[PDB]
Amino acid sequence: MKIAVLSRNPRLYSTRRLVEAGIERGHEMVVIDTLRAYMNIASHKPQIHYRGKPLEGFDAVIPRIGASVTFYGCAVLRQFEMMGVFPLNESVAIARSRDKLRSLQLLSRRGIGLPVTGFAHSPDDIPDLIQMVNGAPLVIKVLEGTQGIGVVLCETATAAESVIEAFMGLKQDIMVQEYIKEAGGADIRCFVVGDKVIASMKRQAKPGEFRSNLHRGGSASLIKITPEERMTALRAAKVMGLSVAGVDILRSNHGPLVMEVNSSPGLEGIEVTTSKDVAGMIIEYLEKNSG
Amino acid sequence: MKIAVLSRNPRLYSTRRLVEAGIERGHEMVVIDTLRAYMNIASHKPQIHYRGKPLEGFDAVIPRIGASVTFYGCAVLRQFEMMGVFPLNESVAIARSRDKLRSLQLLSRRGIGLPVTGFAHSPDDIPDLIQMVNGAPLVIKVLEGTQGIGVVLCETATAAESVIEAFMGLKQDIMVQEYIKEAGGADIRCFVVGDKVIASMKRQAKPGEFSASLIKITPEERMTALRAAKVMGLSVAGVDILRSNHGPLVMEVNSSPGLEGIEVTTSKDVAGMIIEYLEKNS
Amino acid sequence: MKIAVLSRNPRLYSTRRLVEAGIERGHEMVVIDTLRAYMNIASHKPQIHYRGKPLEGFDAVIPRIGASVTFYGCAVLRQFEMMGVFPLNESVAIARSRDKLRSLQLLSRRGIGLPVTGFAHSPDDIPDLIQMVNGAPLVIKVLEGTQGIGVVLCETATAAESVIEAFMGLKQDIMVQEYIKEAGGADIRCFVVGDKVIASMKRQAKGSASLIKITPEERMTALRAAKVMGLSVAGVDILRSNHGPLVMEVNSSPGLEGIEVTTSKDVAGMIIEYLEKNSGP
Amino acid sequence: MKIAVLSRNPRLYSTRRLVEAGIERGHEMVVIDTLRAYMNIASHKPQIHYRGKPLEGFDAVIPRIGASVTFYGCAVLRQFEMMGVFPLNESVAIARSRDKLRSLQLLSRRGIGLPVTGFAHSPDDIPDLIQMVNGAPLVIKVLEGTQGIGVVLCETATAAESVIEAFMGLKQDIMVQEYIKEAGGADIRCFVVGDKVIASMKRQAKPGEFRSNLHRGGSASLIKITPEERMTALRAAKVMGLSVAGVDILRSNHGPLVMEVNSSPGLEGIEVTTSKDVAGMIIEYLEKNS
Ligand SMILES: Nc1ncnc2c1ncn2[C@@H]1O[C@H](COP(=O)(O)OP(=O)(O)O)[C@@H](O)[C@H]1O
Ligand SMILES: Nc1ncnc2c1ncn2[C@@H]1O[C@H](COP(=O)(O)OP(=O)(O)O)[C@@H](O)[C@H]1O
Ligand SMILES: Nc1ncnc2c1ncn2[C@@H]1O[C@H](COP(=O)(O)OP(=O)(O)O)[C@@H](O)[C@H]1O
Ligand SMILES: Nc1ncnc2c1ncn2[C@@H]1O[C@H](COP(=O)(O)OP(=O)(O)O)[C@@H](O)[C@H]1O
């Protein structure tokens, strides 16, 4: 197969690993910076050009779209799709995932377990917003399109109101979420490829904090996931319509709760922890479903 | 009916006219600034609140979403949809329309007549981009999400290259389009409601550059407008069309078109016919 | 006199009042939207044009520059200065005031009382930043050029760290400041014209503005703060602390509605009266 | 000496060369990403901290401030100045240079030769703006703070009006400048350190175009500069109040004309062309004036 890898940086672990796994399995791997791609839209002969030459004869494309102000990245993926190239994840599904507001609304409607969650931008009655989410303690995230830029635990409704008012000032979309203290600042990252959770790992916060992220001074370890945690991860990915996804889960008193569904999950964390060829299994999935 | 009108400004002609037409026809009309709406997402009892009180018992919603950095506006419309409220245009369709890149790609694939069109952001070979669009003269638009912020006619490939390089500097998505000189700086704005073009008008430039009046549209211009709206999946849309040597060409499909221009020119109750459409399909 | 009023919004109270006070005192008042002004820079005959016609014979200019992404507004003021027109406040001084980081650094160096203050953008050791400012409780402001867009009181170092990390995400300049609880959510706004505090008022949180007799050291602080920035007309915000008056902000074009409604003083008038005396030949 | 180098990227040619030249001459060279510096402002004991540890005992600082949305970078340089550290270029001077509108106004007032130049943002009468600058052909630049983001040569007043209207739409500060066709798409880049032009080079455009930039398929070569070109470069730098500056000059029919004054000029172009230790002479300047 000839496979395109849509990546802003070819020197990043996850992109390097995808070209390795591909080359290893006898495929021709081309890294494309989507911004440097330009195209002619047309019924008959639609073209994508790159550094003066046309992009032809591609069998599959792996979209690794970053959390940028990038409607253009999805447009380049869409051209590939319309020119017959098989996508790892469809542009339709990626657009659903990257809109965190839309993503949670869709999971909520299909009955996926979520924390109690509120949305706001310029609310006039902030006390009313806090009351709607069963009050403090509340986690308060800001959204800059795709990225959940800042996260604050507010213990009292006074602190919650004070922080929401600050974020309002910055004209940002605000997310207010029930704090799940039982988790102990830990989450399960389940890694979906096709109909299977191929790899899983627990993330843990530092001695003091609640922020579980791997790239914020955080230990990762092996974990045996429950059948309902597996079932939740697969269902979450299927609702978004993704073939490959990372699903973040919280172990709560009332079962597993989905935090995020990522349409292009990082590979360094999961591979170092599990010693699994995740990059390999992604390429292996393309081999079977490319047709 | 109780009808919500999602508008940032209730004092704008198009919003005023929609509440008038509604009140006139015996409906309860509520104007909602989507940003001041806040909600709880939930399977069982999903709520939208507004200035301390809940929003209940709405039968239909008219989304007038502006060309802002507003993923939130679509989210408020989506809650209404999921809470059973009938939308004039579905959030799915509006998202398609507001992404001008995606919009033209979708029209192109379904064989709707378009000008020859190219897209770029950081192209390394600009001469190659110009060659792909059959060269100058070229119209060059910048895109800031939904809005086509700036527009330049470039007569020579030198000017085209010089302008594209400038817009590249501003890190903006660039659209390069075949200039249709036959149009004479005029376009047909067709106004779609359901399966019908209810109103049309010609727009004209000043004596030199590239005034609105009545115009009888061809059967193929009508058919193009309806097909363009159906491809986007819109019930109500404004479709801009160029009269070219090789037939009608679609410029834009607007999911919430302005009412002042079309109503002043045609003297038609367009606001009324939109409310009348909600009455039948609600 | 012929006086230009550089205002981004010509319908606003403060601009209207400045043309009134001027007309009342027999002057010719022209309101200029700085963005709609265009100019040719030149040694001999430097021109400013506006809506097709040249701007000539101006004796003084009142710069009301807004907190925008506006290097252009200062450029229009600079042309006026270079064309011999007397400015109410010099472009040099306005540039000092609008850079809130630079403003506090300059006040600090000349020994003006300030709250204990820290600056950050992408700090690696946030606990270290908090320690440098004598810890919580801390007030945490974000800066978008001129405006202090958002303000959060953080009671504990945990909350301080959590909020700073959030603002870091937004790639904004961050200000960390000692919380002065003694103030009771109140500040003195002193209004400087020349060598005099012509008007003052207390502001209160939930809000209310009211009359206040200012101390001799509060007056002296306001005048010194304005003189350090090099402003002839300025609003100086002050906190009453246990260890004396502390300057919060120095505004190079302070609003007139608040101060005039509260004091019933012709502040617009006294500004025009200042131009009459110091405009000179 | 202990010398701080304020640079976002320590792996860039110009920063590497400045630490080399310093180390070579027996100095302690520390690279500081200004954004990762945080400080306490205070009369008595004003601190700058960096990755948990304080920054102490610095004798001089070399500011390499980029064309970013960075009021913060100047603030970090200002702390160093106020804490007694000698700057290669003063924060005051750098602020003058980076504001291209202010920079040209200041050069114009002190009688430095410039092209005929106009400024606009939201002009109502664009034909009037074009007339004020002696009409087409006109060069039209957009400004995003410090950077001259786009540059367009407009041959006719029709094209000039059409391009200005487009840039107006983007709510950007617009610069309109007399096109100097005699230059042949070539400029002199003079390199100032103290009271001396230590190095110079001609830049040339491709067979067709006018854009003389090195990173646009453009030849650089050695050039003997006139005494008036030297005098112009030094005077331009002195008006901005810079000790180290790159001054771009056009050879015109009516003498040398200054295009730009750069407060932190690149070193790769000038050093490759001249084979001079420019990095060395900058460090040598700090040694004498510190
Ligand atoms: N509502 C919440 N309740 C409990 N923990 C939460 C909550 N929101 C976020 N967290 C914690 O913060 C971590 C990171 O936040 P999240 O927004 O899910 O991810 P990211 O930082 O990658 O955007 C989570 O894995 C979890 O440990
Ligand atoms: N490629 C083109 N060929 C001919 N006319 C064009 C072209 N692009 C734009 N125009 C003219 O400009 C009008 C509006 O410009 P356009 O960028 O399409 O939309 P907007 O009105 O939103 O700026 C069109 O209706 C048409 O009259
Ligand atoms: N560090 C602080 N200590 C005490 N009160 C403060 C502090 N910072 C702000 N305030 C209070 O906040 C209000 C002023 O808000 P702010 O945005 O800082 O000022 P401005 O009106 O100049 O923008 C006043 O009531 C003032 O007392
Ligand atoms: N008005 C003009 N007349 C002649 N040549 C010009 C003019 N403006 C720019 N140029 C040429 O274009 C080159 C590009 O400079 P420019 O892009 O404006 O500077 P920078 O990229 O350093 O901000 C100049 O060095 C000069 O050779």
Author numbering:
A (entry chain D): 1 to 291
B (entry chain C): 1 to 210, 219 to 290
C (entry chain B): 1 to 206, 218 to 292
D (entry chain A): 1 to 290
Source paper text:
The RimK system allows for Pseudomonas spp. to adapt through post‐transcriptional regulation by altering the ribosomal subunit RpsF. RimK belongs to the ATP‐dependent carboxylate‐amine ligase superfamily of enzymes 13 , 24 which includes other members which can add amino acids to the C‐terminus of their target proteins. Each individual RimK unit has a classical ATP‐grasp fold with an elongated shape of approximately 60 x 35 x 30 Å. 25 The glutamate binding domain of each RimK subunit is linked to the ATP‐binding central domain by a flexible linker region, which is likely to allow the protein a range of motion to enable it to act like a classical “clam shaped” enzyme.
RimKPA was crystalized in the absence of its substrates; ATP, cdG, and glutamate whereas RimKPS was crystalized with both ATP and cdG present in the cryoprotectant. ADP and glutamate, of presumed cellular origin, were resolved in the RimKPA structure whereas ADP alone was resolved in the RimKPS structure. Within the RimKPS and RimKPA structures, the bound nucleotide was interpreted as ADP rather than ATP in the predicted ATP binding site, potentially due to a dephosphorylation event prior to crystallization. For RimKPS and RimKPA, the ADP molecule interacts with a core set of six side chains: K141, E178, I180, F210, S212, and N213. Although there is a high degree of sequence similarity between the active sites of the different RimK proteins, clear tertiary structure differences were present within their binding sites, with the RimKPS binding site appearing significantly more open than that of RimKEC. The residues H215, R216 and R211 are oriented in opposite directions in RimKEC and RimKPS, with all three pointing towards the active site in RimKEC, thus reducing the size of the active site cleft and encasing the ATP/ADP binding site. Previous work has shown that RimKPF and RimKPS are biochemically interchangeable, having similar ATPase activity levels and the ability to add an unlimited number of glutamate residues to RpsF, suggesting they have similar modes of action in vivo. Consequently, and as expected the addition of RimBPS stimulated RimKPS ATPase activity in a concentration dependent manner.
